[PDB]
């Protein structure tokens, strides 16, 4: 369990960013690591087999704006990024989840189109294949995995921001709606902690949110927990040692550098560190510290 860091990749502040930085909760330190080959905001991060993957996004630059179909792999032992097989389609404002060593890429945008499509990556074959599409087109969608089921929560379908959510059952290659959240959320942070899917922050169409709600998969209900100290949309999120960490985002005024930490036992959020600069639209995941 020891020696794991919270990695933040990419993001946006004035333009899409190439940063890869890693935070050590045990000592409060940040390390700046190898830049992404291509700056990207609106991407997702995940880890399989100790390797960090950066998936999708968009390069917003002064010289153009290009949605990304890329999958890039970072090896902490070498501090190097390597390209992996690209997805079938560019996916900005993507969500990803990992089931049994496979990466699922969910939704996202390409230009004006809002995807319902979903595809699955096999690291052992370096191949992607499409699986069943969601019941709803979703960009800015939160994705998490609990009990080897994939959840897609909230987002924006091209016309409305969504409180709806749905679950993918891999053995049937089928999506089913679940109870909708109490709040419309696009660009929330979605993660799993114990037996619940948490949806933190986001944008409801009017304001960035500090509220946080959790879906208990046994009871099929969404319940609010303590709100974050900051309203935030387009935040990064991960879980580490039984606590939720939220990173950055936008509060309606400022690109946040705040990192907050939720303790489920006390139902409290605390400020734990600040990123080296404020940013939104990051990918986040946890893996071994680099060499
Ligand atoms: C060209 O500039 C960029 C490019 C990329 C990014 S990004 O990579 O962070 N992706 C943004 C995002 C992902 C997911 C969801 C949302 C939701 N929008 C809001 O919260 C929102 C609403 C009104 C004004 C603003 C925002 C907002 C959000 C973040 C930073 C600044 C702002 C505003 O100034 C939603 O549209 O539902 C946005 C950020 C800026």
Swiss-Prot record:
UniProt superkingdom: Eukaryota
Q: Which residues carry this modification: S-cGMP-cysteine?
A: 112
Mention any one GO cellular component term assigned to this protein in its UniProt record: endoplasmic reticulum
Q: What does this protein do?
A: Substrate-specific adapter of a BCR (BTB-CUL3-RBX1) E3 ubiquitin ligase complex that regulates the response to oxidative stress by targeting NFE2L2/NRF2 for ubiquitination. KEAP1 acts as a key sensor of oxidative and electrophilic stress: in normal conditions, the BCR(KEAP1) complex mediates ubiquitination and degradation of NFE2L2/NRF2, a transcription factor regulating expression of many cytoprotective genes.
* Full-protein interval shown: 323 to 613 of 624
Per the record, the major location class is: cytoplasm
Q: What is the effect of changing residue 161 to M?
A: Impaired interaction with NFE2L2/NRF2
PTM summary? Non-enzymatic covalent modifications of reactive cysteines by electrophile metabolites inactivate the BCR(KEAP1) complex. Accumulation of fumarate promotes the formation of cysteine S-succination (S-(2-succinyl)cysteine), leading to inactivate the BCR(KEAP1) complex and promote NFE2L2/NRF2 nuclear accumulation and activation. Nitric oxide-dependent 8-Nitro-cGMP formation promotes cysteine guanylation (S-cGMP-cysteine), leading to NFE2L2/NRF2 nuclear accumulation and activation. Degraded via a proteasomal-independent process during selective autophagy: interaction with phosphorylated SQSTM1/p62 sequesters KEAP1 in inclusion bodies, leading to its degradation.
Q: Relate the assembly described in the record.
A: Component of the BCR(KEAP1) E3 ubiquitin ligase complex, at least composed of 2 molecules of CUL3, 2 molecules of KEAP1, and RBX1. Interacts with NFE2L2/NRF2; the interaction is direct. Forms a ternary complex with NFE2L2/NRF2 and PGAM5. Interacts with (phosphorylated) SQSTM1/p62; the interaction is direct and inactivates the BCR(KEAP1) complex by sequestering it in inclusion bodies, promoting its degradation. Interacts with NFE2L1. Interacts with BPTF and PTMA. Interacts with MAP1LC3B. Interacts indirectly with ENC1. Interacts with SESN1 and SESN2. Interacts with HSP90AA1 and HSP90AB1.
Record localization: Cytoplasm; Nucleus
Briefly explain the null phenotype: Early postnatal lethality caused by abnormal cornification. Mice survive until weaning and probably die from malnutrition resulting from hyperkeratosis in the esophagus and forestomach that cause gastric obstruction. Defects are caused by constitutive activation Nfe2l2/Nrf2, leading to constitutive expression of phase 2 detoxifying enzymes. Mice lacking both Nfe2l2/Nrf2 and Keap1 reverse the hyperkeratosis phenotype and are healthy and viable in normal conditions.
The family this protein is said to belong to? Belongs to the KEAP1 family.
Write down the species: Mus musculus (Mouse)
Site entry: Sensor for electrophilic agents: 112
Give, from the UniProt record, the effect of changing residue 41 to A: Impaired interaction with SQSTM1/p62
Result after altering residue 233 to A: Impaired interaction with SQSTM1/p62
Q: Tell me which residues bear S-(2-succinyl)cysteine.
A: 291
Protein name, per record: Kelch-like ECH-associated protein 1
> What does the annotation give as the result of altering residue 12 to A?
Impaired interaction with SQSTM1/p62
Q: Which GO terms describe its molecular function?
A: disordered domain specific binding; identical protein binding; RNA polymerase II-specific DNA-binding transcription factor binding; transcription regulator inhibitor activity; ubiquitin-like ligase-substrate adaptor activity
Keyword line: Cytoplasm, Kelch repeat, Nucleus, Repeat, S-nitrosylation, Thioether bond, Ubl conjugation, Ubl conjugation pathway
Q: What is known of its domains?
A: The Kelch repeats mediate interaction with NFE2L2/NRF2, BPTF and PGAM5.
User: Its Gene Ontology biological processes?
Assistant: cellular response to interleukin-4; cellular response to oxidative stress; in utero embryonic development; negative regulation of response to oxidative stress; negative regulation of transcription by RNA polymerase II; proteasome-mediated ubiquitin-dependent protein catabolic process; protein ubiquitination; regulation of autophagy
- Per the UniProt entry, the disulfide pairs are none
């Amino acid at each position: 369990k020891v020696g794991r860091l919270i990695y933040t990749a990419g993001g946006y502040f004035r333009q899409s960013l190439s940063y890869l930085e890693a935070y050590n909760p045990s000592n409060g330190s940040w390390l700046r690591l190898a830049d992404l080959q291509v700056p990207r905001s609106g991407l997702a991060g995940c880890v399989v087999g100790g390797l960090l993957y950066a998936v999708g996004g968009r390069n917003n630059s002064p010289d153009g704006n290009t949605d990304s179909s890329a999958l890039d792999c970072y090896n902490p032992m070498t501090n190097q990024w390597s390209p992996c097989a690209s997805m079938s389609v560019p996916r900005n404002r993507i969500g990803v989840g990992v089931i049994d060593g496979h990466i699922y890429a969910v939704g996202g945008s390409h230009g004006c189109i809002h995807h319902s499509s979903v595809e699955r990556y096999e690291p052992e074959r370096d191949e992607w294949h499409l699986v069943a599409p969601m019941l709803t087109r979703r960009i800015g969608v939160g994705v998490a995995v609990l009990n080897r089921l994939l959840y897609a929560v909230g987002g924006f379908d091209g016309t409305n921001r969504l409180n709806s959510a749905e679950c993918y059952y891999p053995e049937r290659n089928e999506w089913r709606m679940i109870t909708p959240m109490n709040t419309i959320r696009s660009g929330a942070g979605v993660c799993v902690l114990h037996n619940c899917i948490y949806a933190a922050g986001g944008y409801d169409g009017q304001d960035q949110l500090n509220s946080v709600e959790r879906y208990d998969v046994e009871t099929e209900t969404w319940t609010f927990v303590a709100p974050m100290r900051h309203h935030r949309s387009a935040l990064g999120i991960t879980v580490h040692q039984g606590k939720i960490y939220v990173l950055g985002g936008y509060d309606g005024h400022t690109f946040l550098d705040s990192v907050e930490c939720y303790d489920p036992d006390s139902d409290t959020w605390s400020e734990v560190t600040r990123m080296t600069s404020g940013r939104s639209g990051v990918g986040v995941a946890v893996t071994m510290e680099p060499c």
